[PDB]
């Protein structure tokens, strides 16, 4: 919260100016500081707003001389941390490390500053309010500021490289989370130089992520390449051809419930799908998709299309009889009604439809039993919100299965009105065939474009379209409110006028005309204005903005489709039985590499 | 006027060649000048067309030797200015300063040229006829030509830095108005070096603008950054984090009736909205919008939508009865008429509609008493013409309120025909909901695109559209003028033919066909030509030009939407009560900075 941080800095500067010791520490006025520190009647434990000492203020404003005379006067101030909520564990060593002062860090370490101090304040937690996240320990601070000498000098004073913060992150995790990806790899190597192993690279955080899995999730492609330099083995280089064995242990994750690939492809960060196009991963997912994933996806698409053909055939042949009562309203055109449950199964064709309806019911039950554990396995927002995992398609297939079971309930209890859930089920279940467009380069990018338009600019067109429809529909309705509806019935009542104005917006019905009668002139003026504003202008502006969007997100559509193919492959390997999905890669016992499994990549370089 | 300036130069060169003294001053022929100046029977006060002396002609053509021999011969020519209308106050010192001749300026200043001479001619006023605007005094001329030595030497001779021209502009104002923004900041610093204070930077012009407010209005972003360097205070720099206090005294304008932000966002210059994206301003307006402006705008949008729902409901349930007379015309389809005032309020539902109509009337009265003082506060052209301030939306909401009160007048006086102002009021009042699209990133840019298309290429499409409609409608009308209108009635008379050709232009009605009868062949030829030229070609050309426009002004649409958000925030703070809008920023009495208010910006720089 910006107001809270501003009010904290208000209090901090007020208590710095209010205390002469903190004021002399902030400025370089060492003289008044000297007369203050020759006073032996105080322990120099004066605190600011957040409980910081004068050594913290001297370290903050880079006053090395004021700081060193403070520790000659009071040597215990190096151990003292700040106390209040934004700075629960900040010491002067943290400020000296973050300011990258070698002499100040040496001077604090000479008098006994703790290297294991945890800055557990709210200003150091991984928060989007905070601009940086350097961890809690001075070693992670030194690794993140890029000062290798402070890292070496802290390790020589006993800084734990295995120290974890409140999120469970070690120094490797925090180094991966840095935006300065260039020298973060060099600092990663420098911290790996003191590993000595129960290795630091295999330590997970509180989310269960190792630094390899965290670099996969966060989309750190530079750190991913740097980490897979240490996991590759060049077999031979014959001319331009090079054979390389890549370790698949931390990528394939064969004996793992939650795999590296699933964590990469279901990550909420945009650059995480750039991990899927790196050298060990792209070849692995390409082999998995082109060898097992595409035929199984085609088979599942074929049986789902046959299932929807059966459901459509059962919908067409649904049991209807002639209506019992007689029509008194001339506007009533209903001639048929639903049969009762006893009347609906007295024919051989009715028994065939019963077999098909049982197939439809057990298919909806199969869909629910196959996707409810997938809701319970991951986050429900992450299940239904990810374009890559198939979120809206999961929404509409669960809705289709629920509508099919609701139609079964209404059929068993003789409830009239099955046309409503049957129509929603037909539309949604057939639109769920567009999930299987992911398997093809032609159809998948266009389906992603359709979804991006639905949740994008069609939604923003709908508000202003409803505004124009409401105004012009009310004008059209009150224009024809005094006229005979038998001559022009497009605006006879207000819902009909709203629907007619919606249809005239999209120009899917003709303009209401009757040349044998005299129409109101306000209809002519209002419809001319509606034709200029809605038809000629807002439709084609929406079409042009859709064309601009289609030009602008074409690349992102392509990475989203490749990530959708990877997600489909991961889901298919996870959910299908293991005998249909053999282990990818080759085992490495003949290479002297143990029971590990490897991917062989042969590449040509000039 | 170019003809006037050309005729002045005609006269000027005619009187330069006509007088031997001015001719000898123009050329470097110092010999004939010497025989002229040894004549002691003349005071050498010969004047040209605009009353200039020979010293002016010598300074114009960079004749230093002729000028100094003129000043030895006639020393009083340095005091003499030109006299006529384009050069009312121009002296030879002005020409010497503008030509950047150090020796000539020194020679004029040695013999008593006035440093306080005001060039009040028409060639020096701030005019779009004039290419440059350097002010009226030689100090502003020296500041604007970029010669720092002439500035220093004029101040050493007593040039007033607080001198104002006819527009009230000081040298700081004129330095801001220069297009050469690079060294204008250096000259601004050089003139601020002699300020000694009642400061020069706090002096307003005749428009009330200080140089800070003028740099805001004119969009001088370089001068704005340069002026906000002197109004910022860096608190601390801890690692990559920097905390800076920015002064909000000349930006927020809390106790001022016309604020800096309002003057920036309602400026008629295009680059002024680039002021709103600078470091102290963008954070301030973002905090103001995201903390108070967006919820108040959402609440006002919700109550306006509820008000239009009430107005639409009162329009739907408007009092109508069966018509008294009988229909003799078979083309007449009117079955209902308006009730009288005594007949319209004899029902409980009629009383509910009366309550809703009173709500509608008091809402229109609230709209008028809320926006008429806003017309009187600013320029009416600037109120109704600015896209950023909401000009056309103000036009249509004032028109809607006027139509509602007109409908009240017709209802009270039993005037038939309320459907016309009710229909215009319904369309315009519902289209006024699109004003509240400014609060959202989805809707606001698209509404700006709609307005830019309405006042842009739809207008230019309408003329050629009316041309094609007139020609083809007249051809269609005279084609079917001899035919039976009961078989094809689209072109029975000329307004119907015009409306039908308008609808066939946009393809919102079908082509007139009747296969049971024989149509004229000229209808087929003319409609084929109309379908090729108007439908296939001009519509899609207008759509393609709209798509090109949508591609080309997308960026400008984005700055216009951000400026609209700033304008909405400024209007909401100005018009709502002060207890709903607390003062932005933090007070600075604990920083040793007085009663000023500051914005704290914490930024990260690597």
Q: Which residues does residue B316 pair with via DSSP β-bridges, in sequence order? A: none
Contact B252, B585 (CB under 8 A): yes
Nearest to A515 among B238, B490, B506 (CB): B490
Which two three-digit tokens encode residue A348?
């051989």
What is the least distance, in Å, from the CA of B550 to any CA of chain A? 7
Q: Which residues contact B369 (CB under 8 A, 6 or more apart)?
A: none
Contact A98, A140 (CB under 8 A): no
Q: Which residues does residue B337 pair with via DSSP β-bridges, in sequence order? A: B321
Q: Is the dihedral of CA B301, B303, B308, B313 positive or negative?
A: positive
Which two three-digit tokens encode residue B442?
């989805």
- Collapsing DSSP states into helix, strand and coil, what is residue B89? coil
Which of B508, B514, B585, B587 to mutate: most A Cβ within 10 Å? B508
Q: Which residues contact A176 (CB under 8 A, 6 or more apart)?
A: A184, A188, A211, A214, A215, A218, A220, A223
Q: Is the dihedral of CA B382, B385, B389, B391 positive or negative?
A: positive
* A100–B603 CB contact, under 8 Å: no
* A193 and A50 co-located in one domain: yes
Of B46, B127, B31, nearest in space to B85 by CA:
B127
User: What Å distances lie between residue B33 and A138, B57, B95, B101, CA to CA?
Assistant: 85, 13, 21, 22
Rg (CA), chain B: 35
* A551 and A594 co-located in one domain: no
Provide the Cα torsion A543, A544, A550, A553; round to 10°. -130
CA A61 to chain centre: 40
* B422 and B486 co-located in one domain: yes
* B241–A132 CB contact, under 8 Å: yes
User: If you search the block for the tokens 């394939």, which residue do you land on?
Assistant: A252
CA A92 to chain centre: 38
Q: Which residues does residue A244 pair with via DSSP β-bridges, in sequence order? A: A234, A601
Half-sphere CA count of A464, side-chain side, radius 13 A: 28
Q: Which residues does chain B break after (C to N > 2.5 Å)?
A: 197
* A294 and A340 co-located in one domain: yes
Which of A456, A482, A552, A553 to mutate: most B Cβ within 10 Å? A482
* B562 and B575 co-located in one domain: yes
* B294 and B235 co-located in one domain: no
In chain B, the residue whose alpha carbon lies closest to the alpha carbon of A180 is: B606
What is the least distance, in Å, from the CA of B259 to any CA of chain A? 24
In chain A, the residue whose alpha carbon lies closest to the alpha carbon of B538 is: A536
* B197 and B328 co-located in one domain: no
- The pair phi, psi for residue B65, each rounded to 5°, is -70, -40
| Given resolution (angstroms) | 2.6
What is the least distance, in Å, from the CA of B334 to any CA of chain A? 4
Contact B279, B246 (CB under 8 A): yes
Contact A74, A92 (CB under 8 A): no
Nearest to A537 among B429, B430, B453 (CB): B453
* B216 and B261 co-located in one domain: yes
- The pair phi, psi for residue A244, each rounded to 5°, is -130, 135
* B210 and B248 co-located in one domain: yes
Is A510 known to sit in a ligand binding site? yes
- Burial, A100: exposed, middle or buried (Cβ in 10 Å; 0-12, 13-18, 19+)? middle
* A494–B316 CB contact, under 8 Å: yes
Query: In chain B, which residues have their Cβ closer than 8 Å to the Cβ of A468?
Result: 430-431
User: What Å distances lie between residue B183 and B124, B144, B179, B231, CA to CA?
Assistant: 22, 9, 10, 20
* A387 and A513 co-located in one domain: yes
In angstroms, rounded to a whole number, what is the distance separating the alpha carbons of residues B132 and A257?
75
Q: Quote the Cα angle for A68-A74-A80, to 5°.
A: 95
In angstroms, rounded to a whole number, what is the distance separating the alpha carbons of residues B573 and B259?
11
* B333–A468 CB contact, under 8 Å: no
Tell me which residue range forms the domain holding B203. Answer: 1-278+584-606
Query: In chain B, which residues have their Cβ closer than 8 Å to the Cβ of A455?
Result: none
How many domains does the structure of chain B reveal? 2
Q: Which residues does residue B601 pair with via DSSP β-bridges, in sequence order? A: B244
Q: Is A552 on the interface with B (CB under 8 A)?
A: no
CA A369 to chain centre: 25
Nearest to A526 among B235, B423, B606 (CB): B423
* B422–A478 CB contact, under 8 Å: yes
Experimental technique for the deposited model: cryo-EM
Which two three-digit tokens encode residue B210?
């200080």
Q: How does B75-98 read in b/e, with b if 16+ C-beta sit within 10 Å?
A: eebbebbbebebbbbbbbbbbbbb
Q: Is B418 on the interface with A (CB under 8 A)?
A: no
* A318 and A243 co-located in one domain: no
* A13 and A92 co-located in one domain: yes
In angstroms, rounded to a whole number, what is the distance separating the alpha carbons of residues B17 and B46?
13
Query: In chain B, which residues have their Cβ closer than 8 Å to the Cβ of A98?
Result: 238-239
* B332–A517 CB contact, under 8 Å: yes
User: If you search the block for the tokens 């029902």, which residue do you land on?
Assistant: B347
* B336–A95 CB contact, under 8 Å: no
In chain B, the residue whose alpha carbon lies closest to the alpha carbon of A513 is: B509
Query: In chain B, which residues have their Cβ closer than 8 Å to the Cβ of A548?
Result: 547, 550-551, 554
- Collapsing DSSP states into helix, strand and coil, what is residue B215? helix
Long-range contacts of residues B7-16, Cβ cutoff 8 Å, at least 24 apart: B8/B49, B8/B50, B8/B84, B8/B86, B11/B49, B11/B50, B12/B48, B12/B49, B12/B50, B14/B49, B15/B47, B15/B48, B15/B49, B16/B48, B16/B57
């Amino acid at each position: 919260w910006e107001q809270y941080r501003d009010r904290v800095n208000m209090l901090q500067q007020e208590r710095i100016r209010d205390s002469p010791l903190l004021q002399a520490a902030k400025e370089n006025d060492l003289r008044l500081l000297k007369i203050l520190l020759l006073n032996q009647s105080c322990d120099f434990q004066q605190r600011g707003a957040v409980g910081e000492t004068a050594l913290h203020v001297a370290a903050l404003y880079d006053n090395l001389e004021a700081a060193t005379l403070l520790m000659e006067a009071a040597p215990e101030l190096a151990k003292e941390p700040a106390l209040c909520e934004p700075f629960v564990g900040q010491t002067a060593l943290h400020i000296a490390v973050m300011n990258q002062n070698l002499n100040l860090v040496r001077a604090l370490l000479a008098r006994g500053a703790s290297v294991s101090a945890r800055a557990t304040g709210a200003a150091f937690r991984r928060s989007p309010h905070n601009l940086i996240y350097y961890g809690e320990h001075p070693l992670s601070f030194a690794a993140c500021v890029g000062s290798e000498e402070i890292v070496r000098l802290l390790i020589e004073h006993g800084a734990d490289i295995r120290a974890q913060d409140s999120l469970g992150n070690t120094v490797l995790h925090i180094l991966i989370l840095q935006p300065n990806k260039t020298f973060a790899c060099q600092m990663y190597n420098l911290l790996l130089s003191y590993d000595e192993h129960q290795s630091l690279e295999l330590v997970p955080n509180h989310q269960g992520l190792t630094p390899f899995k965290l670099a996969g999730v966060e989309g750190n492609t530079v750190m991913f390449q740097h980490l897979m330099q240490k996991r590759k083995h060049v077999q031979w280089t014959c001319g331009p051809l090079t054979s390389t064995l890549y370790d698949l242990t931390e990528i394939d994750s064969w004996g793992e419930e939650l795999s590296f690939l699933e964590l990469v492809v279901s990550s909420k960060k945009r650059e995480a799908r750039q991990i899927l196009e790196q050298t060990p991963v792209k070849e692995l997912v390409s082999f998995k998709w082109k060898k097992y994933g595409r035929p199984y996806f085609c088979v599942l698409a074929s049986l789902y299309i046959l299932y929807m053909i059966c459901f459509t055939t059962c919908c067409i042949y649904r049991p209807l009889k002639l209506r019992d009562d007689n029509r008194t309203d001339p506007r009533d055109i209903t001639i048929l009604q639903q049969k009762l449950l006893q009347e609906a199964y007295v024919t051989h064709q009715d028994n065939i439809r019963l077999v098909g309806e049982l197939v439809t019911v057990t298919g909806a039950v199969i869909i629910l039993l196959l996707e409810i554990p997938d809701i319970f396995r991951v986050g429900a927002s992450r299940y239904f919100g990810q374009t890559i995992l198939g979120g809206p398609f999961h929404v509409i297939i669960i809705t289709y299965a629920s509508l099919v079971l609701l139609t079964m309930v209404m059929r068993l209890t003789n409830m009239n009105g099955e046309v409503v859930p049957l129509s929603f089920a037909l539309v949604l279940g057939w639109c769920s065939v567009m999930y299987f467009a992911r398997g093809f380069q032609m159809l998948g990018p266009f389906t992603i474009m359709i979804q991006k338009m639905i949740f994008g600019d069609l939604m923003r067109f709908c508000w202003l379209m409803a505004v124009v429809i409401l105004g012009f529909a009310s004008a059209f309705h009150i224009t024809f409110q005094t006229e005979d509806p038998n001559n022009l019935g497009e605006f006879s009542d207000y819902p009909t006028a709203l629907f007619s104005t919606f249809e005239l917006f999209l120009t899917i019905i003709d303009g209401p005309a009757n040349y044998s009668v005299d129409l109101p002139f306000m209809y002519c003026i209002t419809y001319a204005a509606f034709a200029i504003i809605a038809t000629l202008l807002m439709l084609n502006l929406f079409i042009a903005m859709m064309g601009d969007t289609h030009w602008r997100v074409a690349q992102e559509r392509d990475e989203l489709w490749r990530a959708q193919v990877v997600a489909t492959t991961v889901m298919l390997e996870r959910k299908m039985p293991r005998f249909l999905w053999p282990r990818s890669g080759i085992c490495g016992y003949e290479y002297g590499l143990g029971d590990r499994w490897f991917l062989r990549v042969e590449n040509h370089h000039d």
